């Protein structure tokens, strides 16, 4: 009974492997001009936290920031002039996620408490109060993204993903597919959905449908993922000191962003406008700026005194915000 | 050069800074201790004796506030959420000491202690070892299957010699003999002075940390 099932599964595996397999992007990108050297200098230094910050998100206006650290504090920032717009106390000090709603009305936070809390910013009486406290996950939440003003997607360590409804805290959709899910990236059109797990794999789901659409395999656990601005590709960063780029329409791997001088994993991954600079926040006390279309590194963003945790890029590509295990958040331009 | 709007929006930031400054110094007077023992070894019987995810307990003793974090039923990869506990004053490891008769999960406890003690994040964090459940172990000496599980080993039937041998075995599992320090208490079912031992241990480790930071060590 088990032998027949194993043979059948192996038949499918080798069939899809042979079907998904001459040219290479790294070879076809020859005889082209590289970007050169990027040496952007820090423009803003942000203080106030006394802990290791873990997550952040740029606002939709490219001027407001949200920051969460290992202390029970959530800070709304002002990147233009350094002013603390508002501070919010968290019930749970262990938080790993951040989210800024596109409307700017709500923020989200979650951590080891297995629940995600929504805070409302623009309210009467000049206060920020909890709007919803969604629960139903057995584990630690890894990422949260606002699909819309009323829909949110959460990935936790229970090897499943959830699509919720703010109006009614009941779960709307559950995605099952192992290893702990560590990162989440939302489609630019908010139509698709991707999640990378600890089993050295990533999965692309269908938000409307509710079932997995595609799978990608590389090795070690994956803890960073982000969509390309086009929406037909994404970038992943694993703990094996290797960064990779995958294409939805190809179901293959293009090139590896690795160097023999680094044996350190990747903590955060992000892109810029037009998808030309891929910024990878490593755990070797500094970030790196790879060329997403080239196999050669371009620039290094040093200046942090500890492991870089979070990393964000504005919607218009005007500044890059980096955070690390030291409580200073830096804005680079 | 600031406008009337901007001038009034700087005092807001100053008030926020003052609030975080006064709030941030209240979290530096509390000592963090991490429970990491086995679930059925007696953790539930020791948290209440002193008086979903992570459980936080707040105690007071000798005008000192203790925060105790229990990761009871996370059931996730320990390598992905153990970073948050870097900098914890001490790790309280607890064992049942009477689970060698399963023949084994005693080797599982030994492996777990080896993994936690030799962790890269806890290279300078003290470990307090609690050997519990003495009543059953002492009352099973009549037909203790210690020779059955270890046919090649020979020893006395007295429980004190076995306790000394097993404490030595747990101590020898340590690989960093210069930074870390394992403390054993011999906790019992009906003990009352468990808090005093942990208070003395944290006082000793904080004095040693102050001496190291000052420059003498």
């Amino acid at each position: 009974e088990l032998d027949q099932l194993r043979q059948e599964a192996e038949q499918l595996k080798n069939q899809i492997r042979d079907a998904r397999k001459d040219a290479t992007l790294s070879q076809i990108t020859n005889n082209i001009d590289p970007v050169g050297r990027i040496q952007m200098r820090t423009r803003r230094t942000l203080r106030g936290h006394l802990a290791k910050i873990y997550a952040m998100h740029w606002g939709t206006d490219s001027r407001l920031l949200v920051s969460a650290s290992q202390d029970g504090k959530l800070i709304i920032w002002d990147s233009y002039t350094t002013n603390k717009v508002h501070a919010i106390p968290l019930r749970s000090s262990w938080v790993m996620t951040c989210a800024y709603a596109p409307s700017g009305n709500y923020v989200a936070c979650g951590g080891l408490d297995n629940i995600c809390s929504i805070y409302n910013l623009k309210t009467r009486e000049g206060n920020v109060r909890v709007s919803r406290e969604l629960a139903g996950h057995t584990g630690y939440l890894s990422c949260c993204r606002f699909l819309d003003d009323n829909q949110i997607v959460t990935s936790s360590g229970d090897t499943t993903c959830a699509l919720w409804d703010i109006e009614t805290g009941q779960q709307t959709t559950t995605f099952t597919g192992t290893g702990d899910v560590m990162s989440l990236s939302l489609a630019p059109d908010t139509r698709l959905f991707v999640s990378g797990a600890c089993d050295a794999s990533a999965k692309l789901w269908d938000v409307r449908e509710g079932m997995c659409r595609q799978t990608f395999t590389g090795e070690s656990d994956i803890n960073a993922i982000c969509f390309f601005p086009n929406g037909n590709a994404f970038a992943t960063g694993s703990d094996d000191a290797t960064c990779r780029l995958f294409d939805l329409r190809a179901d293959q791997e293009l090139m590896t962003y690795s160097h023999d001088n680094i044996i350190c994993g990747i903590t955060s991954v992000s892109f810029s406008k037009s998808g030309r600079l891929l910024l990878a926040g490593y755990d070797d006390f500094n970030c790196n700026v790879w060329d997403a279309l080239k196999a050669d590194r371009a620039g290094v963003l040093a200046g942090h005194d500890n492991r870089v945790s979070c990393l964000g890029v504005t919607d218009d590509g005007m500044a890059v915000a980096t955070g690390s295990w030291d409580s200073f958040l830096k804005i680079w331009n | 050069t600031l406008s009337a709007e901007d001038k009034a929006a700087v005092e807001r930031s100053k008030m926020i800074d003052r609030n975080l400054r006064e709030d941030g110094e209240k979290a530096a007077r509390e000592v963090k201790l991490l429970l990491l023992g086995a679930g059925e070894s007696g953790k539930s019987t020791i948290v209440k004796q002193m008086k979903t995810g992570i459980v936080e307990t707040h105690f007071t003793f000798k005008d000192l506030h203790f925060k105790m974090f229990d990761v009871g039923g996370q059931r996730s990869e320990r390598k992905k959420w153990i970073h948050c506990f870097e900098g914890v004053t001490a790790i309280i490891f607890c064992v049942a000491l009477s689970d060698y008769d399963l023949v084994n999960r005693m080797h599982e406890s030994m492996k777990l202690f080896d993994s936690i003690c030799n962790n890269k994040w806890f290279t300078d964090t003290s470990i307090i070892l609690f050997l519990n459940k003495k009543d059953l172990f002492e009352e099973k000496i009549k037909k203790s299957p210690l020779t059955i599980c270890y046919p090649e080993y020979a020893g006395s039937n007295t429980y004190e010699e076995a306790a000394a041998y097993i404490q030595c075995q747990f101590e020898d599992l340590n690989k960093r003999k210069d930074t870390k320090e394992i403390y054993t208490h011999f906790t019992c079912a009906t003990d009352t002075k468990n808090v005093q031992f942990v208070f003395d241990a944290v006082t000793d480790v904080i004095i040693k940390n102050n001496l190291k930071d000052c420059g003498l060590f």
Epitope: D78, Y80, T81, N83, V85, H86, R124, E125, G126, N127 | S3, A4, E5, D6, K7, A8, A9, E11, R12, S13, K14, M15
Partner: single-chain antibody, 223 residues
Framework: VQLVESGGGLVQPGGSRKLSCSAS????????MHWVRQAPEKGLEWVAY????????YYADTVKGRFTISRDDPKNTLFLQMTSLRSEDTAMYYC?????????????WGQGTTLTVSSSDIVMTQATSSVPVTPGESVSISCRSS???????????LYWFLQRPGQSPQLLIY?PDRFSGSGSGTAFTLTISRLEAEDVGVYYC?????????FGAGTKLEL
């Protein structure tokens, strides 16, 4: 949700009294709170302003050293102490509040209290004066800035308080639905999509950039 001003002013000349105000359901500890008066025929102008934390006690140029403001955040009470009463105190006092993020100041206005006695000036002129409202059409309000209200930050100061016949004014633009505002340099235009019986009232225009927000200059467009 509620801001009640108390203290009825009717005393013999030569005395002093207090005018208090209390707020319900507000974060009074994080709100700046101005004080304004309305004459029988005039606009709205500052008489006092206090910021959060009590670090800014700006007063008015008309009266100085006689009026003072005291605040109690735990008691949620703000009151005015007045000394050396003069004949020019026959106004309705209001206790508007505001807050400044890095966002809509002068939002809520109080009911106000009476102040009566028992028995170098900026001026603006417009080509149109007291234009009656023609039924079946829509009215538009034009305004020009004497100085350059636009700041280097691009934050043009443009307030359009509307006072219906009643108790307290309201906000139209802080920097309804039918009310709209079009700005071009020194020219400002308020537009109303449709008229209604509740749309009739008095409008006031902006002439302030510096510390004293004296925007009391404004034509009475009741008819």
């Amino acid at each position: 949700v509620q801001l009640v001003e108390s203290g009825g002013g009717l005393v013999q000349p030569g005395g002093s009294r207090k005018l208090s105000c209390s707020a319900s359901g507000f974060a009074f500890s994080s709100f700046g709170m101005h004080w304004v008066r309305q004459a029988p025929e005039k606009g709205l102008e500052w008489v006092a302003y206090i910021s959060s934390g009590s670090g800014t006690i700006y007063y008015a140029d008309t009266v100085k050293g006689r009026f003072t403001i005291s605040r109690d955040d735990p008691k949620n009470t703000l009151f005015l102490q007045m000394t050396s009463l003069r004949s020019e105190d026959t106004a309705m006092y209001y206790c508007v509040r505001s807050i400044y993020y890095y966002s809509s100041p002068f939002d809520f206005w109080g009911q106000g209290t009476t102040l009566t006695v028992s028995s170098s000036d900026i001026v603006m002129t417009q080509a149109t004066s007291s234009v009656p409202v023609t039924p079946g059409e829509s009215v538009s309000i034009s305004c020009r800035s004497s100085k350059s209200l636009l700041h280097s930050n691009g934050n043009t100061y443009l307030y359009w308080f509307l006072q219906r016949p009643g108790q307290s004014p309201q906000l139209l633009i802080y920097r309804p639905d039918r009310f709209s505002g079009s700005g071009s340099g020194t020219a400002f235009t308020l537009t109303i999509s449709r008229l209604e019986a509740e749309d009739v009232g008095v409008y006031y225009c902006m002439q302030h950039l510096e510390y004293p927000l004296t925007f009391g200059a404004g034509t009475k467009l009741e008819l």
